[PDB]
Amino acid sequence: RRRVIGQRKILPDPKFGSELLAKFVNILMVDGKKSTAESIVYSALETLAQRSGKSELEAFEVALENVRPTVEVKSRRVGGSTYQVPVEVRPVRRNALAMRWIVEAARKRGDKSMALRLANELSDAAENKGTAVKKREDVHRMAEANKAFA
Amino acid sequence: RKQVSDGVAHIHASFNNTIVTITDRQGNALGWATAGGSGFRGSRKSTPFAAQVAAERCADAVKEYGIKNLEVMVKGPGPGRESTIRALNAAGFRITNITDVTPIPHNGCRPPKKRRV
């Protein structure tokens, strides 16, 4: 409300040193088990970076580039009616949502081990193939379909 | 077909719907399009965007008539009252005149009561 927090500075990626990558590990992290998280992020970040051949953060970026929404609808209760109005998503949010979607979808990929799942979803994303990108499509389709209010 | 190259564009910006009709300077309608008919219904059909998709949708019909330039006849409030025009021109149309043929009686018939909540 009146408050004005902001962006809680996150500790840079250890094996690398990228703030973005760092928060990506937290999103996947669970029960405050930060170690277990990294043990999964890298293992899958490697099995993929290998195939792509290019540096992790590149294949990583590309993957996100697809699962990157530009606009989304924001609920608004104005006039005894909840009108769904779309709006361009800020830069920071874009990366966040993407990462969140990637994991949330990767976690439920029915594979064998989280690592493998993550690796796959991360790939499929880099070419609108997995569920991550799917979300963005449904979200982006939400907008425009409400562009009237936009 | 006839190649008119220049006619008029009537716009019915009704409070609920928005239809755009293109016809030669005679009156003979060459082709028409409507908001409600262009997809979205009820609530969304009576929005500014609605009329837009309609206007362009109309041109995709009368443009085959070799229409180049054309005037603009508008009447009625509601959205798409102005919108329709833009999409009409932007769609590649040499616009010229724009007049509001909105009917305004110097006190004649008694309007309906209605709306009471």
């Binding site: - | 409070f15 009625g76 409030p77 102005e82 025009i85 021109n89 040499r94 010229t96 005149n97 724009i98 007049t99 509001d100 909105t102 305004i104 009686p105 008694r110 309007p111 309906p112 009561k113 209605k114 709306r115």
Partner: protein, 51 residues
């Protein structure tokens, strides 16, 4: 309310309608009427117009 404006230039000059017909009058006659409501509700605009 006519608008020909020679010479090409994507400017509507719509402001014209907004200085006569269109709403205000159209929106006025839209629904029901008044019959007595004006001599009061409308003549109450002065009780405010005073200041």
């Amino acid at each position: 309310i006519k608008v020909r404006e020679n010479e090409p230039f994507d400017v509507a000059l719509r402001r014209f309608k907004r200085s006569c017909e269109k709403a205000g009058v159209l929106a006025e006659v839209r629904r029901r009427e008044f019959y007595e409501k004006p001599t009061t509700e409308r003549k109450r605009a002065k009780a405010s117009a005073v200041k």
